[PDB]
């Protein structure tokens, strides 16, 4: 398994910085002037975190579109993804409209609403059963209709009914619970076991539309998910499973979405993760 021994190599050499700064200078460069405009100031959360303007998702009203979102298209992969910032106070009707408008199946969310003592972002689902939340702004009801606790994860799953048309649809939320406040995980298992009950349910499937993925920024933690996700299907599908280049493969997606992988940590571990799969599919019972 040729990625193993650079993985290997890597970690002997310790040039794991070393590696991830040649990504860092690599990346693609491309317009981002929707995202600063000054009307869109208090939609973004981090100054230096948007989106570029040809991959960012636009809402479907005249008003102002804006949300500080991406469109990750991997043709090969032929895998789909939204990724987006933790929801602001003020944002929280934008999220759900563009759930709706993007007929969005899964929202994968990989950290807690309070970190290190601050708010990461806006609690933007119900809580209980019978206190349903409506977004006057974008005319939405949210409910929650079930919630399952496990011991790395949460799913719940979610009523969002459209009060213009009433139409309603069913939007299955996965709650990563247990990443670490500082650093990553020791083990990807549970992150790995995560990832594949959102498959599981027909989240990541093309039949839907593409999955919203957010953390804090959307670029951290969110692409160590999208690039695990892709890596392993396109083992799975290229004759040589072995050509699958994970740098080049974060190189395209940063294409869509400035700033994916955000520490040399968090590429080691996205590495470990795509081995550790690998190893359980080629040992996979049945
Ligand atoms: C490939 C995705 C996946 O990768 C994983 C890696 C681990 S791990 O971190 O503990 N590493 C590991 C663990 C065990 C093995 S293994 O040698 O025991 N291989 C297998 N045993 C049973 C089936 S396959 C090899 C590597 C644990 C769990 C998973 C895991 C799952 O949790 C998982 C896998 C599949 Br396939 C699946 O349908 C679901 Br649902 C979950």
């Not at 910032?85 to 759900?96: A, D, I, K, R, S």
């Not at 994860?153 to 670490?180: A, C, G, K, M």
């Not at 920024?217 to 969110?222: F, N, P």
Request: charged share 30%; with cysteine.
């Amino acid at each position: 398994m040729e990625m193993e021994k650079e993985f290997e190599q890597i970690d002997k050499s310790g040039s794991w910085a070393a590696i991830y700064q040649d990504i860092r200078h690599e990346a693609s460069d491309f317009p981002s002037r929707v995202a600063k405009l000054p009307k869109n100031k208090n939609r973004n959360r981090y100054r230096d975190v948007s989106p570029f303007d040809h991959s960012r998702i636009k809402l479907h009203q005249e008003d102002n579109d804006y949300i500080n979102a991406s469109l990750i298209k991997m043709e090969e992969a032929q895998r789909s993804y939204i990724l987006t910032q933790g929801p602001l106070p003020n944002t929280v009707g934008h999220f759900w409209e563009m759930v709706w408008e993007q007929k969005s199946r899964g929202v994968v969310m990989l950290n807690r609403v309070m970190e290190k003592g601050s708010l990461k972002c806006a609690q933007y689902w119900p809580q209980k059963e019978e206190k349903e939340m409506i977004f006057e702004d974008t005319n939405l009801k949210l409910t929650l209709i079930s919630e399952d606790i496990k011991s790395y994860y949460t799913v719940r799953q979610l009523e969002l009914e459209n009060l213009t048309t009433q139409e309603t649809r069913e939007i299955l939320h996965f709650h990563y619970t247990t990443w670490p406040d500082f650093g990553v995980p020791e083990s990807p298992a549970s992150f790995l076991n995560f990832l594949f009950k959102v498959r599981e349910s027909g989240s990541l499937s093309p039949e839907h539309g593409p999955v919203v993925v957010h953390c804090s920024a959307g670029i951290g933690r969110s692409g160590t998910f999208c690039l695990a996700d892709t890596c392993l299907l396109l083992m799975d599908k290229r004759k040589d499973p072995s050509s699958v280049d994970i740098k080049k493969v974060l190189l395209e997606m940063r294409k869509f979405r400035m700033g994916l992988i955000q520490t040399a940590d968090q590429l080691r571990f996205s590495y470990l993760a795509v081995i550790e799969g690998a190893k359980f599919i080629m040992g996979d019972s049945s």
